[PDB]
Amino acid sequence: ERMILIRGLTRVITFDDQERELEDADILIDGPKIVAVGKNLSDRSVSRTIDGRGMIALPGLINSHQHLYEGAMRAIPQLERVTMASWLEGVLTRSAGWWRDGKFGPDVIREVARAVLLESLLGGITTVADQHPFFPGATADSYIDATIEAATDLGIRFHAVRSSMTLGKSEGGFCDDLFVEPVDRVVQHCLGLIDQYHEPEPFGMVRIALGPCGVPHDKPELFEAFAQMAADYDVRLHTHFYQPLDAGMSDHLYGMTPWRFLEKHGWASDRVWLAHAVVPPREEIPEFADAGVAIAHLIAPDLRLGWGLAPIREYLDAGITVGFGTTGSASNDGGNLLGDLRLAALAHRPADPNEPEKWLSARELLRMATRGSAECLGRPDLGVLEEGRAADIACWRLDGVDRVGVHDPAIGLIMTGLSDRASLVVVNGQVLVENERPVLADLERIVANTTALIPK
Ligand SMILES: [Zn+2]
């Protein structure tokens, strides 16, 4: 029950309510939580002191949108340069194919998940929300059991978002039958997951969320069902939102915009975070704000697929919560959240060539990647370095030869570097990464084991 002191961090970014930062300052940790953050903290009941000099410390990064199983689908030549339709076909085909060859069972997803999750820790990411949409077998298989098992073995904080594709081509869908589950099978399964896995209490390490793939891909019955289940069991709701084709598909199936559809079917609530949000009607943005939905900025796939730049400034101006994420590795293709912030930092600028004040700043992006994401996930106990909050902490060295000359360390973190490898990472008060290495997980063994299971 003994504490941990991180002493003399060169810079500490808190993202508390004042955006306080401190210099040559400490973080005191006791079990799952932060006890204090400030200069010259007492080592009174401390059983280990960690030398933070030369480091910048942030709240642990929170990846608010992953698809772990896609770790197996990286850097496929056929999928290097493809639009959404071909990409979606390519991933679905591969996952369905590997699955009926017996090459993609929950045992495989578990080890893919273990690799990408460990990569995540090493990149300073302390919480991941994975959306798994793939459940063939008639009895919905243990894919989420498998990702939760990897997360738990690793000690990374975890949100399991049970996804689906419930709208088939026989109803106007762009999927297939092997992945199309009846709505009731999705709903039954979700209930069992909550009861078995959900840790609603503060500092909870595993939580469940309900996440249809999207309005073009799922039945309204599912959304309404989930809206009921979310209020009955106090869990959260997640889906994709305003991908370029969606407005057209939503109007064709239902005669309304994707937002108006969500509104109708119970999803205009503070009960919701929404992935991408690339091309909304501007007129709807103030409505996102009053509804209290949050939005996850996913720059890497938005660029990768040719979709472009989501109006993040507008969301910020409207007071909408904005978080950040990588998405799956079939459309990123890495799980490197920190690197992806540099992508956003730069790619937004050409869209407002003469109004640099509109450009997202390093600190606004770092906020998205911590506090913003914590809020997307409904976690007031994460995303902030201050007393009472979770001791989830990520730190990077500032004294490498590739960061010589850096005047502001936080900007430096986005704008410079050969490597996004974190030095020191703490989750739920447990040191998981030190000197850029895992201290509990066996790195080489995990690389070997997962590599052996990746399908040809
Ligand atoms: Zn996604």
Side-chain angles (χ1 to χ4, degrees), residues 65-67 70 87 131 213 238 240 243 275-276 298 301 327-328 331:
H65 191 96
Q66 255 290 5
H67 306 293
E70 295 182 12
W87 178 91
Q131 198 176 17
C213 167
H238 186 47
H240 301 83
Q243 298 180 157
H276 305 276
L298 313 178
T327 220
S331 67

Side-chain angles (χ1 to χ4, degrees), residues 13-43 45-168 170-266:
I13 315 297
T14 63
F15 293 120
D16 73 21
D17 282 343
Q18 322 317 321
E19 315 282 81
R20 285 209 306 156
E21 311 167 15
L22 300 72
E23 178 169 89
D24 296 313
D26 314 344
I27 304 166
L28 186 57
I29 295 156
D30 193 21
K33 78 184 66 168
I34 299 173
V35 165
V37 178
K39 291 178 172 286
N40 292 113
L41 299 179
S42 159
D43 51 287
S45 289
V46 165
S47 80
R48 193 195 163 178
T49 298
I50 306 167
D51 180 15
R53 285 170 296 170
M55 301 187 170
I56 178 159
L58 270 58
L61 309 186
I62 299 168
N63 193 343
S64 48
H65 191 96
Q66 255 290 5
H67 306 293
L68 297 176
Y69 75 95
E70 295 182 12
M73 308 198 181
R74 288 173 156 156
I76 297 179
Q78 294 80 345
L79 300 175
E80 184 178 16
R81 296 179 283 169
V82 292
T83 45
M84 182 40 136
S86 330
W87 178 91
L88 197 52
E89 180 71 336
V91 177
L92 298 167
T93 286
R94 278 183 176 75
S95 48
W98 296 340
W99 176 75
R100 69 137 193 80
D101 293 337
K103 298 172 181 144
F104 223 41
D107 67 311
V108 171
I109 272 62
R110 186 178 62 239
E111 300 305 321
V112 170
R114 199 189 311 276
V116 183
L117 283 175
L118 172 66
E119 170 191 350
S120 298
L121 287 169
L122 290 171
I125 297 161
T126 51
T127 298
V128 171
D130 188 42
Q131 198 176 17
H132 191 98
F134 157 77
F135 294 98
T139 278
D141 221 336
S142 52
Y143 286 112
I144 279 174
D145 309 85
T147 60
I148 288 167
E149 178 177 332
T152 279
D153 287 358
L154 286 175
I156 201 177
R157 193 172 309 265
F158 196 64
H159 294 220
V161 187
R162 204 288 192 184
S163 190
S164 61
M165 270 180 299
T166 54
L167 195 56
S170 200
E171 259 127 328
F174 291 63
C175 187
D176 44 49
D177 197 48
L178 178 70
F179 286 5
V180 182
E181 306 170 85
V183 168
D184 290 330
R185 167 184 184 168
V186 176
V187 166
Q188 184 191 49
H189 184 225
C190 284
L191 295 163
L193 286 179
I194 299 173
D195 186 68
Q196 195 192 342
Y197 286 125
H198 191 68
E199 309 184 2
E201 72 278 6
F203 315 123
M205 282 296 278
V206 172
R207 284 201 194 165
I208 302 300
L210 319 174
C213 167
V215 176
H217 317 105
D218 281 285
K219 291 188 201 271
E221 285 67 29
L222 186 59
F223 283 88
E224 298 200 345
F226 276 165
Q228 178 69 234
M229 189 186 304
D232 286 348
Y233 289 88
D234 199 23
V235 301
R236 291 182 56 81
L237 302 168
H238 186 47
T239 192
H240 301 83
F241 191 51
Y242 281 114
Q243 298 180 157
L245 295 170
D246 297 346
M249 282 171 90
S250 183
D251 176 272
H252 174 245
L253 292 155
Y254 305 116
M256 49 192 152
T257 75
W259 173 241
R260 285 284 180 261
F261 172 98
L262 297 187
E263 229 179 0
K264 181 161 205 249
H265 300 299

Side-chain angles (χ1 to χ4, degrees), residues 324-339:
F324 208 95
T326 56
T327 220
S329 287
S331 67
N332 181 295
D333 288 6
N336 180 2
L337 194 65
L338 180 51

Side-chain angles (χ1 to χ4, degrees), residues 351-369:
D352 288 290
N354 309 127
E355 303 184 84
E357 67 275 3
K358 283 188 178 168
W359 303 349
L360 307 172
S361 75
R363 286 172 164 76
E364 279 174 322
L365 295 163
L366 289 160
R367 191 206 188 270
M368 291 170 201

